[PDB]
Amino acid sequence: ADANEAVALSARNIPGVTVVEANGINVLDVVNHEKLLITKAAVEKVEEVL
Amino acid sequence: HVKKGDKVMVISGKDKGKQGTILAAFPKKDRVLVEGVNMVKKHSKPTQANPQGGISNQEAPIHVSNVMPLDPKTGEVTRVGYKVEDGKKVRVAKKSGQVL
Amino acid sequence: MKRTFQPNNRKRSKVHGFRSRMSSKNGRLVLARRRRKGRKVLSA
RNA sequence: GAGCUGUAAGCAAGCUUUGAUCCGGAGAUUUCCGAAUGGGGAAACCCACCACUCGUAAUGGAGUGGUAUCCAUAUCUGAAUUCAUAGGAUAUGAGAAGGCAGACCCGGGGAACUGAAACAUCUAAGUACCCGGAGGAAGAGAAAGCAAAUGCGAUUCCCUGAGUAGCGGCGAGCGAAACGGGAUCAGCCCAAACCAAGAGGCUUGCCUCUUGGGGUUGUAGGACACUCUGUACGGAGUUACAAAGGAACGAGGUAGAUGAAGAGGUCUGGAAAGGCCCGCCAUAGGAGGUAACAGCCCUGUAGUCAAAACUUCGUUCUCUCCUGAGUGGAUCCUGAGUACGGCGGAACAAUUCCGUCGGAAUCCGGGAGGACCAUCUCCCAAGGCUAAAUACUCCCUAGUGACCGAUAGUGAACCAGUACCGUGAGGGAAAGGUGAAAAGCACCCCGGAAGGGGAGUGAAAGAGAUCCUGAAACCGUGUGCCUACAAGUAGUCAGAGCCCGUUAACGGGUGAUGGCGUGCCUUUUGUAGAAUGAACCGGCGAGUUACGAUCUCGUGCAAGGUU
RNA sequence: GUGGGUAGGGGUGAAAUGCCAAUCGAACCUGGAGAUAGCUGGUUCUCUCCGAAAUAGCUUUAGGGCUAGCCUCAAGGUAAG
RNA sequence: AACAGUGGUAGGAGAGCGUUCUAAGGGCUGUGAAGCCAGACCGGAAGGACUGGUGGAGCGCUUAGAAGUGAGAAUGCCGGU
RNA sequence: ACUCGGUGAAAUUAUAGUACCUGUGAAGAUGCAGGUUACCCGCGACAGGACGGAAAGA
Incomplete structure (x- = not known):
């Protein structure tokens, strides 16, 4: 939703994982990464922005 | 991480598995002379030193990352750490915790 | 040595x-130009 | 915190855990030339004077300081002129003198080619270039404005207005501004008029000389006269706001410290970081190295720290300094040869610049809104100072490329502005790769040597010193087929004989004889030509990018579409 | 012989090419400058479909340029040719 | 399927082959990569494989993207002969 | 000059197994047509062609 830091620090070293906040999603990092993990709050934020 | 006079063990190369004593160190090149390890045969001409001459049998320096010290209590290879005992920093053995 | x-x-x-x-x-001006180019020899 | 005496060999002699080599801060020494400055001079050198010191019986010799010019401040004297003054002398001056960063900005001077198919102006262009001044930035700056409104209110920079208005042999072309949207955002001080003090001419008065208060203004303010209000416990500050020193805390910069986890087994191999079968760490899977492709081998990385000494910023204390608001408006001030006019060139009713003569007003006062004449609307000239937003980087630090990879990329990956060329200004190259490690070939043999053949090292010696790979032209040795009665752009189609045996295919090599057949490119009406070019081989070598115009196709939305 | 002087829209003092560093009817070097040229030469892989012109009118026109004529691609009219 | 057609310079239009790089997916390769040499193989062309030798460490396939994009001629420039 | 021993360049150069005659032909045929001659390879001379260069009229 709004860039919590514990999740950003973890998975920073895992070689295939990228963490972004709600207003950072864009076409390349959605198409490129096979799977999408999203929190229920980020779903609401993306829905209300668009 | 190792210096002259240390008991080490070779990890990589033809002599992998051998263990010996450091005789010299070359920190300007990260090379090190280990006894009984990486023996060469130099064809030396007759000259003032060694008047008759011949084919020698000496050691040659290997790379310092090919060798690791020995843990004092187990005898296996250990990584190096640095503690400060008495106003003096000492190399420690990560595997156990003993000095040198 | 020259x-x-x-x-x-x-x-x-x-x-x-x-x-x-x-x-x-x-x-x-000539000397300044030759110093700028980096000449080993300035003038005669 | 253990080796060290650079490259970089060798060969000697030494230093170092009572702590070297090395890295960072602060110091010391710093020959000679060079602005070069005691005088001279063909830069790297000659020759001096003064004071002190070393040395000689003395002359001769040596060492250490001072000795240029201009400017300023004085002090004396003081050419003409007596003082004065030019000057001279004397002193005191971290004054200024030159360099550069081929960049950025102020000022002065200032081309030509070109284009306009020609040339008449213009354009090129206030460009190139030259001269002077600087600063880390620089002029620019707080309305005698825009302009016409419900007005905004210093300057500068970006978007838009707009390639519009306009200027243009109105042709090429040149080319605005205001409004609106943003970045950054503070405005002040003096003169003048009045008060107090001393003097200096004047007779006191008067009147100027200075010093302290005073005051900075336009739907005028100040002086001035009178009211409250103060001189502090409040405010401000060295960045303009007059002016002006220290001390403590915090964060940086210039060395560094610490820092997780695999020798996993096994296979090939010269070597494992690779394959296969297993584990671990991760705020660390950036990067480089190591005998092949490493997270866990090394240096490291993430995260935490660390400074004796210099520095760069902040915060606080300390320090220093300091009144405002009213009523009036009797009487004075609000920036002198200026504002404006003529006279010429310059520039070019004309327009301005500069000179060339003139020459007001001044609050009931002026200046403006293209001219003049009146209405209304805004402002207050002839004094000064101001940061920020912007321009550029010779340099230093950390990084990044659908950038180059040794004819490329800097001219220069290598002792490159070098070697060479020129009298000089100046011009200006070529040249990277042993191997993981020198383990860089003891010894034997031929040879004067060079160079070879063994032996040996090495995974490789056909990796042996211009030593990775090594193509083509060019030069050779051996051999299968043909060739000494034959006339030819040299091949192509038909075709015996001989020799082979393939990516097995109506196979490969060579070819005695027969038919046909005037190279390639460019150019031209037309070439085989006595049109043109190429000795051969290799490398390099030419329709791009930016901004406008227009057309087609695709996508989105559609009378709306877009920032 | 040695040491010197005159510098480029100048010198060699008007009368002489005899020249000024292989340069002279205007020296040389760097820059404007990748100047300009209607003149000259060159422009690198392949196949498929279609396929010209060398004629008239102007241009101070001068082998250059513009308008018609002749080629190709696309969309419509359609069946006019 | 049935007809009809397929010479070509300037020129117009169409479809493709190769090269370097980048992105995604998939892979090769020390039991031997790129490069070099040879061959009697495959496609309509540009071209592409497969075997053997040398070489001794990197390369390629699919789909997109971007170009310093392909050489026999310039009295081209540099080297070798 | 020539032979022998030593050393050793340059202009030029599309490739080339490069005869002659009579014709044909964009300039003048070695390379086109028809015919006639000619065993293979050199060394020394000539200057005929030399589409050699000089020239120059113009």
Whole structure:
């Protein structure tokens, strides 16, 4: 939703994982990464922005 | 991480598995002379030193990352750490915790 | 430890020499240009 | 915190855990030339004077300081002129003198080619270039404005207005501004008029000389006269706001410290970081190295720290300094040869610049809104100072490329502005690769040597010093087929004989004889030509990018579409 | 012989090419400058479909340029040719 | 399927082959990569494989993207002969 | 000059197994047509062609 830091620090070293906040999603990092993990709050934020 | 006079063990190369004593160190090149390890045969001409001459049998320096010290209590290879005992920093053995 | 060319020709030094180059703004411009290029030898 | 005496060999002699080599801060020494400055001079050198010191019986010799010019401040004297003054002398001056960063900005001077198919102006262009001044930035700056409104209110920079208005042999072309949207955002001080003090001419008065208060203004303010209000416990500050020193805390910069986890087994191999079968760490899977492709081998990385000494910023204390608001408006001030006019060139009713003569007003006062004449609307000239937003980087630190990879990329990956060329200004190259490690060939043999053949090292010696790979031209040795009665752009189609045996295919090599057949490119009406070019081989070598115009196709939305 | 002087829209003092560093009817070097040229030469892989012109009118026109004529691609009219 | 057609310079239009790089997916390769040499193989062309030798460490396939994009001629420039 | 021993360049150069005659032909045929001659390879001379260069009229 709004860039919590514990999740950003973890998975920073895992070689295939990228963490972004709600207003950072864009076409390349959605198409490129096979799977999408999203929190229920980020779903609401993306829905209300668009 | 190792210096002259240390008991080490070779990890990589033809002599992998051998263990010996450091005789010299070359920190300007990260090379090190280990006894009984990486023996060469130099064809030396007759000259003032060694008047008759011949084919020698000496050691040659290997790379310092090919060798690791020995843990004092187990005898296996250990990584190096640095503690400060008495106003003096000492190399420690990560595997156990003993000095040198 | 250098190379010398005509170390006896006085007219050469009085025409293309250092002290003649330093005697007018144009010669000083010449010396500045040769220093900018990086020449080993300035003037005669 | 253990080796060290650079490259970089060798060969000697030494230093170092009572702590070297090395890295960072602060110091010391710093020959000679060079602005070069005691005088001279062909830069790297000659020759001096004064004071002190070393040395000689003395002359001769040596060492250490001072000795240029201009400017300023004085002090004396003081050419003409007596003082004065030019000057001279004397002193005191971290004054200024030159360099550069081929960049950025102020000022002065200032081309030509070109284009306009020609040339008449213009354009190129206030460009190139030259001269002077600087600063880390620089002029620019707080309305005698815009302009016409419900007005905004210093300057500068970006978007838009707009390639519009306009200027243009109105042709090429040149080319605005205001409004609106943003970045950054503070405005002040003096003169003048009045008060107090001393003097200096004047007779006191008067009147100027200075010093302290005073006051900075336009739907005028100040002086001035009178009211409250103060001189502090409040405010401000060295960045303009007059002016002006220290001390403590915090964060940086210039060395560094610490820092997780695999020798996993096994296979090939010269070597494992690779394959296969297993584990671990991760705020660390950036990067480089190591005998092949490493997270866990090394240096490291993430995260935490660390400074004796210099510095760069902040915060606080300390320090220093300091009144405002009213009523009036009797009487004075609000920036002198200026504002404006003529006279010429310059520039070019004309327009301005500069000179060339003139020459007001001044609050009931002026200046403006293209001219003049009146209405209304805004402002207050002839004094000064101001940061920020912007321009550029010779340099230093950390990084990044659908950038080059040794004829490329800097001219220069290598002792490159070098070697060479020129009298000089100046011009200006070529040249990277042993191997993981020198383990860089003891010894034997031929040879004067060079160079070879063994032996040996090495995974490789056909990796042996211009030593990775090594193509083509060019030069050779051996051999299968043909060739000494034959006339030819040299091949192509038909075709015996001989020799082979393939990516097995109506196979490969060579070819005695027969038919046909005037190279390639460019150019031209037309070439085989006595049109043109190429000795051969290799490398390099030419329709791009930016901004406008227009057309087609695709996508989105559609009378709306877009920032 | 030695040491010197005159510098480029100048010198060699008007009368002489005899020249000024292989340069002279205007020296040389760097820059404007990748100047300009209607003149000259060159422009690198392949196949498929279609396929010209060398004629008239102007241009101070001068082998250059513009308008018609002749080629190709696309969309419509359609069946006019 | 049935007809009809397929010479070509300037020129117009169409479809493709190769090269370097980048992105995604998939892979090769020390039991031997790129490069070099040879061959009697495959496609309509540009071209592409497969075997053997040398070489001794990197390369390629699919789909997109971007170009310093392909050489026999310039009295081209540099080297070798 | 020539032979022998030593050393050793340059202009030029599309490739080339490069005869002659009579014709044909964009300039003048070695390379086109028809015919006639000619065993293979050199060394020394000539100057005929030399589409050699000089020239120059113009």
